Design a protein around this motif. Structure first.
Motif, PDB file in Angstrom:
ATOM      1  N   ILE A   1      -3.449  37.122  -5.916  1.00  0.00           N
ATOM      2  CA  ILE A   1      -3.233  37.234  -7.354  1.00  0.00           C
ATOM      3  C   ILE A   1      -3.398  35.877  -8.029  1.00  0.00           C
ATOM      4  O   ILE A   1      -3.935  35.784  -9.138  1.00  0.00           O
ATOM      5  N   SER A   2      -2.948  34.804  -7.375  1.00  0.00           N
ATOM      6  CA  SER A   2      -3.151  33.472  -7.935  1.00  0.00           C
ATOM      7  C   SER A   2      -4.635  33.129  -8.008  1.00  0.00           C
ATOM      8  O   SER A   2      -5.095  32.535  -8.988  1.00  0.00           O
TER       9      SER A   2
ATOM     10  N   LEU B   1      -6.202  25.956 -16.609  1.00  0.00           N
ATOM     11  CA  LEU B   1      -6.577  25.853 -15.206  1.00  0.00           C
ATOM     12  C   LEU B   1      -5.878  24.685 -14.528  1.00  0.00           C
ATOM     13  O   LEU B   1      -5.262  24.856 -13.469  1.00  0.00           O
ATOM     14  N   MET B   2      -5.967  23.480 -15.101  1.00  0.00           N
ATOM     15  CA  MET B   2      -5.387  22.386 -14.336  1.00  0.00           C
ATOM     16  C   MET B   2      -3.871  22.352 -14.473  1.00  0.00           C
ATOM     17  O   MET B   2      -3.201  21.868 -13.557  1.00  0.00           O
ATOM     18  N   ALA B   3      -3.301  22.930 -15.540  1.00  0.00           N
ATOM     19  CA  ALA B   3      -1.851  23.110 -15.557  1.00  0.00           C
ATOM     20  C   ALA B   3      -1.401  24.055 -14.445  1.00  0.00           C
ATOM     21  O   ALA B   3      -0.428  23.773 -13.731  1.00  0.00           O
ATOM     22  N   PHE B   4      -2.116  25.170 -14.268  1.00  0.00           N
ATOM     23  CA  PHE B   4      -1.782  26.114 -13.207  1.00  0.00           C
ATOM     24  C   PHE B   4      -1.951  25.480 -11.831  1.00  0.00           C
ATOM     25  O   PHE B   4      -1.137  25.712 -10.929  1.00  0.00           O
ATOM     26  N   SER B   5      -2.998  24.671 -11.651  1.00  0.00           N
ATOM     27  CA  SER B   5      -3.197  24.036 -10.354  1.00  0.00           C
ATOM     28  C   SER B   5      -2.137  22.979 -10.078  1.00  0.00           C
ATOM     29  O   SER B   5      -1.722  22.821  -8.928  1.00  0.00           O
ATOM     30  N   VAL B   6      -1.684  22.250 -11.101  1.00  0.00           N
ATOM     31  CA  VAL B   6      -0.587  21.307 -10.892  1.00  0.00           C
ATOM     32  C   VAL B   6       0.692  22.046 -10.512  1.00  0.00           C
ATOM     33  O   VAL B   6       1.446  21.600  -9.636  1.00  0.00           O
TER      34      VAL B   6
ATOM     35  N   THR C   1       3.115  29.981 -14.168  1.00  0.00           N
ATOM     36  CA  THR C   1       1.801  30.608 -14.263  1.00  0.00           C
ATOM     37  C   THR C   1       1.801  31.739 -15.287  1.00  0.00           C
ATOM     38  O   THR C   1       0.780  31.990 -15.935  1.00  0.00           O
ATOM     39  N   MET C   2       2.947  32.403 -15.465  1.00  0.00           N
ATOM     40  CA  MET C   2       3.061  33.495 -16.423  1.00  0.00           C
ATOM     41  C   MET C   2       2.925  32.982 -17.852  1.00  0.00           C
ATOM     42  O   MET C   2       2.179  33.547 -18.659  1.00  0.00           O
TER      43      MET C   2
ATOM     44  N   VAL D   1      -9.839  34.353 -13.712  1.00  0.00           N
ATOM     45  CA  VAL D   1      -9.814  34.757 -15.119  1.00  0.00           C
ATOM     46  C   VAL D   1      -9.664  33.541 -16.024  1.00  0.00           C
ATOM     47  O   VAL D   1     -10.107  33.554 -17.179  1.00  0.00           O
ATOM     48  N   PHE D   2      -9.034  32.473 -15.526  1.00  0.00           N
ATOM     49  CA  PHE D   2      -9.052  31.213 -16.263  1.00  0.00           C
ATOM     50  C   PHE D   2     -10.457  30.627 -16.308  1.00  0.00           C
ATOM     51  O   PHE D   2     -10.890  30.108 -17.344  1.00  0.00           O
TER      52      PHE D   2
END
Ligand SMILES: *[C@@H]1O[C@H](CO)[C@@H](O)[C@H](O)[C@H]1NC(C)=O
Ligand SMILES: *[C@@H]1O[C@H](CO)[C@@H](O)[C@H](O)[C@H]1NC(C)=O
Ligand SMILES: *[C@@H]1O[C@H](CO)[C@@H](O)[C@H](O)[C@H]1NC(C)=O
Ligand SMILES: *[C@@H]1O[C@H](CO)[C@@H](O)[C@H](O)[C@H]1NC(C)=O
Ligand SMILES: *[C@@H]1O[C@H](CO)[C@@H](O)[C@H](O)[C@H]1NC(C)=O
Ligand SMILES: CN1CCC[C@H]1c1cccnc1
Lengths: 393, 393, 393, 393, 393
Positions: free
Chosen positions: A222-223, A363-368, A278-279, A229-230
């Motif tokens: 899911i991640s 994207l990079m916020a989610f990856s951090v 992530t939400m 989708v990002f």
């Protein structure tokens, strides 16, 4: 036989179960206390209760229950039921059972030297603090505190012996690390008397294979889908539908891991924090995509109308990335309509560059967030590899 | 009558329930122990508890409860209640009930030779290890361990007799294979004395018709549907919607089989492994289809931009598969737009060949997973056909 | 009063609760046993337990509890508590309560002739076999087996009397048909002695109005909707969406009737078989419609490429059903594109004839399944109309 | 003190707890019985059990427990525990607790005149019939039937006193209307003796604010939405999607009100009947809209092919509502295709008039169902306004 | 020892557990009562039960249990079991346990001056009123009322001491504010005698971090999404789908906060009122958007057909915001069709202005509801910042 009958008649003569069996009343009676763990039957996190199968072990010396073997040949031990001789009142202080004592009362075995043994079985439900902030890789220490309820230090001299784990039956969910004990004297508001106490600390470590297969794989999938989708270009059909699907599905169904945790507001499991972060990120992504899709797509300057945001966005962009003739003139007009379609596609290119900037932000916020989650979960516990070395197998 | 009253008055004269009824105190008292199973009331896998209906059977000889029938004509047996005569303290070691003893205390029947019989009924909840790694075709062995709590080998001589199943009531879910018993002597940390023990191993086999109809048919249908969507050509509407539907629906609703299994991380049921593998495969299929559908479809070389992947993909492909005149010139231009549509359809043909290669990869990976699952479940247990021969009927 | 005190002092003189109250020890003591049903509190199908409210009725004659009324004027009856006089040990053999005896111990009433009555109340949970293969129109027979635990035929002579239903409180869910009893002598492996036994068979019939309104109406509506989608022409949007909606919704939510049934693999309820059959049929319909919709629609011979299937399909069909000039030539070319659209619609006509053949197959298979279901449920039980005559009202 | 010790020694001399404390054995002993309700702890509709907190009140006169105050100065009352003096055996006939007696046994207080008081507390679970056919505006009458188990009319003369509600703690869900009592004599099959009985009828009225806010508002909104979709013109996208959404959502989620009601097939709550009727209506609407949308839309006479339906529909309608030249000729042909589109829109107008007739049928059927529901729920109970006057506040 | 045995034999001579241990019978016996709270094990809002772990503390003086230490050297205290000496009958009036007394009966410790101490442990389930109208920031006061059941003011003189919290184990969910006690005399309908009473009021404050992270973040996100859909232009696809998604999802899944609250119709939590208000608003928005989208879009005067609504809407608007020639003539006709498309877009502009007026109405109504909710929840409790100062941390 005859000698057993005579001995039983003799032994109970003038006996007083109330009286403490010592030759000298001014000196304490030493009682040796120990435990034997057989099975960890349950570790309930909703109500924070540890349910175990345990044999207690009490040993002491009775002064009056002595006899000479040569006078009663053949009989070497006798057994007495619950209410016929003196027994220590050893209780579990931190009990969670509706009845405060959960031990089956068996016989007391006495030999010719007046040495009493008492090994009652029981299923004990004790309240211990359950911490799932490190779920699913957590170590739990649950205490069992045993002591005499109404006998002080000057009357009953409690002593501790190492617990027995030779008959332990391994659990499929929790791995037993150890069960060490400590004896200490406490002072209460009751009265002026120290009270001995023996505490055994059961230490368990969870087995992560079942929860691993159940949660880690679909969570990773899911991640990855959210990362897609990002990275996906902003469009009406696929982008918005996928974003709302991820949002709703995760927000509704992620509680299957929250249902196994208590509502204690002392800390937060890292998996829940990662899910929430992530939400928020994906929610911001879907709202901004809807805004750039339907709110305005007819002018490139629509989004950049304030200078305050325009300067920052520009800086970010610099830092990152006859009658028949008039009817044929109406054909020229629909050609000009195609030209206006090209103008609209240029506006869409500008708005999609903006949306891709926002998507890179998401994207990079989610990856951090994922990076901090995985670095927390990897180097969390000392000798973490043991799990992957032992549990995953 | 008169003789019954006289006999009852005589028998309890000088009697001591504490004393073990033997003529010689130096010799053990032989006790015959057996079991009678009537119903398997429950087999709970969540808490791993087997709940059964059982009559115990204890027989021994009492030296003091003897009389002469000619002196008391008409009376041949007497009955004594719980606390009036000596009874063995036989307990179930591996009990899971909140009270450690779950037997109803009935009378003890004695005849003229001093032969005591004791057949207490009970509903016993015992903890046994439940293995569902072979679900739904599994055989479970649950142990019942009975023994004297405080009587050693030199005092009580336990003996074993074959269990009785003449009154067994068949269960609708589990099929009873057998219930054999074994008598063994154990050594404990208590003391220097062997302790006899009698263990009965109830063996049950599940009936798969109900679970078969409930799960196998829709599981087969869903697997066939997934095979179809793997074989379906890549398209925006049907392909992506069907893939996401299968993913979400299976991932959410497949837990109806996980809710009947424990969280023990000792092994994984094969059905869960198959579900997870097909789940990963279909997730990869949907993400790759979305990528080849919306990320880029304007150039055939878009997907093959690195040589490292290009070489492998090529190898796989080789191995497998006036003013009016200018307005009419604008009509020629929209004809050229149709030509660009043909160019886009050629790009779509190339990207769809790539997507069909990926789809064939997903397809034969899924079929290999299904093949290993079915070969595991077919030749798993010896004499497997029995199930289809007996249960499906 | 004075006489009551004197009588109570007299009666317990030399009395022995252990002794069986007979004048002659060689003859059995006749005990009359009966039952009084007040309420069927629960019929649980998950665990197969019938919970009822019952008064037992035991009557016998005590030889020693006799007195002369003229000597004690005014007192005609006395009452004795649980442990003061002899009482039969009547137990329910097939009990499911955690404690094997679920009767409240009240007084025993004795009159001047030494006639003892004993009417203890209780809430009895007994295990009986629940059959839902005929749900929701089913008749259940649940047994209650009472007998003396330790008194044989030569000691206690059990007799049966007809049960009392004058105080019965009707249940809203189950209709009581009857409660007949039977007395029989059994032989056990215990010993050489017949054992009397009294068995009451409670017969209940379900009331179908609540379940009728809850399930039959939406089930009929959903079946009609499935018939429609079978009869609906094959199309991308409506047909596939409706088929997948019916499939998923029914497959997920039909378990609300399975949650009220046990997992016994002895038979299958007809409603579940009908659901499964229609489920397979609609799944086949949706997969074949997707195949004929997206797999290939550019040639009429695409589906009939093998002769083996072609022959059978044909048999079934026979059995059932300047520069400006060249720009205007490009206009002729888009007219030819419309002609190719007509060719594609002819291919669609052929493929839709095939799909309608498959749809007719699905349709009459589904109707045959519905017909067998309704003919099974209509002529199932003798005097079935009673239900619609009595329950639906 | 000294006098208390002497009195306690005196009073128990020659006392017999079995004997009924009367001076004359031929006359009944009057016992006054009453109740004190403190809290209605639960009203469970699934199992139909009322759980309350109650103090019983028994008062009688003991002939032997009398003394002279001047001889024992300072002591005016004595207290006796459970098994030391005679107490009435008052039981609740219609009990639902696993143990038939749910009273805590406290002391009996006696004063110098031999007047015994007995006020045991308890939490009583009694079975009463719960009727929700008028939900959520319902009044429930639950009975509590107390009586002596083994003392007839000629021995124990039961009398009734009005219940006490001065210490009642109001419940948040149910409003107490009253608790009146009635004393009556019954005849049983036991024996020839009347048996007194005291029955208290607790009457409760539900508070509808919580359920009002939870259900009435979304139910009204959903009914209005259904009215809209009935009034909405027939179209492919919005109409069918909205109809199927309402159908599935209501059919699945309306069981949140059915989960609070028993399965008794004696009547149906009006809300459930209204839901089912609107459900059938909307199902008919969606099926007919799908039929008129996709089955046939190419001819106005398609729907009216039989004369039998045609006559009724008509009556209802009357009652209610060179080479370049041939290429330009191909342009004329696509103009004729637009003319065929106009013909199809005329067919759609006819079929939409038919569908609007069916929609008006659905509409006024639904409104009649709503009207009968609201007229039933408005003028249902006498003084209904009280609810809106008192509960809604 | 010898002296302990002699003392135990002496002390129980002529002792009467029934008699109240006072030297003078005319004077009350002072009993000091106190409590020791160890753990708040549960606060259940569904059934409104507080489950705690408590040690009672009773102290009094026994006149007869006195001895001279010089005569019995070495023994300073004795211990007596439950039924051997006189103990106060202190009960919890507002108990919710199935058994009315939930204390484990331990020994009573007596020293040389006849001073009796009694500290029984227990797990007490008491019924207290739970108020969640201020959820999740609420303070709960739950009462524990202890008193003597059958001893009046003239016999037992109850006294109160401050509760002990030195051994309290903090709870993860609730923060203990205090536990003050009050002693009061009550009058009952039993009799003419005051009855002392001691009430302890446990005050708890919830910790909002867990519920904060679980609910506030997604609630804020969903409210922002609803604000967006209110601000979003009215369109067929995105607007209606998003509105119906929000409506259904919120209406179905918001009950996860209602499942933790009782059904008491005394007040409504502010979060539920806010949810219901926004729910009505969004429902009105979606119905009006559907009406303005599909009901009529072919004339600007369609919506404003009555003057009564037209005047108000206008006021609101003022207050806020050869053969070839005829074929080319058919081309002119499709140009006129584009002109009719422009006319339809003008009608859409008018209807969208109306829909945006309605959307602004929905928007500021929703914002007023949010404003009243947040101003209620911010300035609700005195010293509210403490929560954010202490709990959020
Ligand atoms: C036990 O009995 C034997 C024989 O009577 C005697 O020799 C021995 O001394 C006795 N033991 C003790 C400690 O008195
Ligand atoms: C039992 O009684 C009869 C008659 O008194 C006698 O003959 C017989 O020997 C007795 N049996 C024994 C073992 O003493
Ligand atoms: C009962 O008492 C009366 C008077 O003493 C006497 O006449 C009568 O015979 C007695 N009944 C029996 C069976 O002895
Ligand atoms: C009670 O005692 C006093 C003094 O002994 C005496 O005067 C009085 O008569 C007694 N009361 C009765 C009813 O005997
Ligand atoms: C206790 O015993 C000692 C020695 O017998 C004596 O001196 C003392 O007075 C006694 N105490 C009392 C209160 O009698
Ligand atoms: C073998 N028995 C059963 C378990 C403990 C042991 C034992 C030994 C002595 C006294 N009680 C129990």
């Amino acid at each position: 036989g005859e000698f057993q009958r005579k001995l039983y008649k003799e032994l109970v003569k003038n006996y007083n179960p109330l009286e403490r069996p010592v030759a000298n009343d001014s000196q304490p009676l030493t009682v040796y206390f120990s435990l034997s763990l057989l099975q960890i039957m349950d570790v309930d996190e909703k109500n924070q209760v540890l349910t175990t199968n345990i044999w207690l072990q009490m040993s002491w010396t009775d002064h009056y229950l002595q006899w000479n073997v040569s006078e009663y040949p053949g009989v070497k031990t006798v057994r007495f039921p619950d209410g016929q001789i003196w027994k220590p009142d050893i209780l579990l202080y931190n009990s969670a059972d509706e009845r405060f004592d959960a031990t089956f009362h068996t016989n007391v075995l006495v030999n010719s030297s007046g040495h009493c043994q008492y090994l009652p079985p029981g299923i004990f439900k004790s309240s211990c603090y359950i911490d799932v902030r490190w779920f699913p890789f957590d170590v739990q220490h649950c205490k069992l505190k045993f002591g005499s309820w109404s006998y002080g230090g000057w009357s009953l001299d409690l002593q501790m012996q190492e617990a027995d784990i030779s008959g332990y039956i391994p659990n499929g969910e929790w791995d037993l690390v150890g069960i060490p004990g400590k004896r200490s004297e406490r002072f209460y508001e009751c009265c002026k008397e120290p009270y001995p106490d023996v505490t055994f600390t059961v230490t368990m470590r969870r087995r992560t294979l079942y929860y691993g297969l159940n949660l880690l794989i679909p969570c990773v999938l899911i991640s990855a889908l959210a990362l897609l989708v990002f990275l996906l270009p902003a469009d009406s059909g696929e982008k918005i539908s996928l974003g709302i699907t991820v949002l709703l599905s995760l927000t509704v169904f992620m509680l299957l891991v929250a249902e196994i945790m208590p509502a204690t507001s002392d800390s937060v499991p890292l998996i829940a924090q990662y899910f929430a972060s992530t939400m928020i990120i994906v929610g911001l992504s879907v709202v901004v995509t809807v805004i750039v899709l339907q709110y305005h797509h007819h002018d490139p300057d629509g989004g950049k109308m304030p200078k305050w945001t325009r300067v920052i966005l520009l800086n970010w962009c610099a830092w990152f990335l006859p009658d028949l003739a008039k009817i044929l003139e109406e054909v020229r007009y629909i050609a000009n309509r195609f030209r206006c379609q090209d103008e609209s596609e240029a506006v869409c290119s500008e708005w999609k560059f903006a949306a891709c900037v926002v998507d890179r932000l998401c994207l990079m916020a989610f990856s951090v967030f994922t990076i901090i989650c995985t670095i927390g979960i990897l180097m969390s516990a000392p000798n973490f590899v043991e799990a992957v070395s032992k549990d995953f197998a």
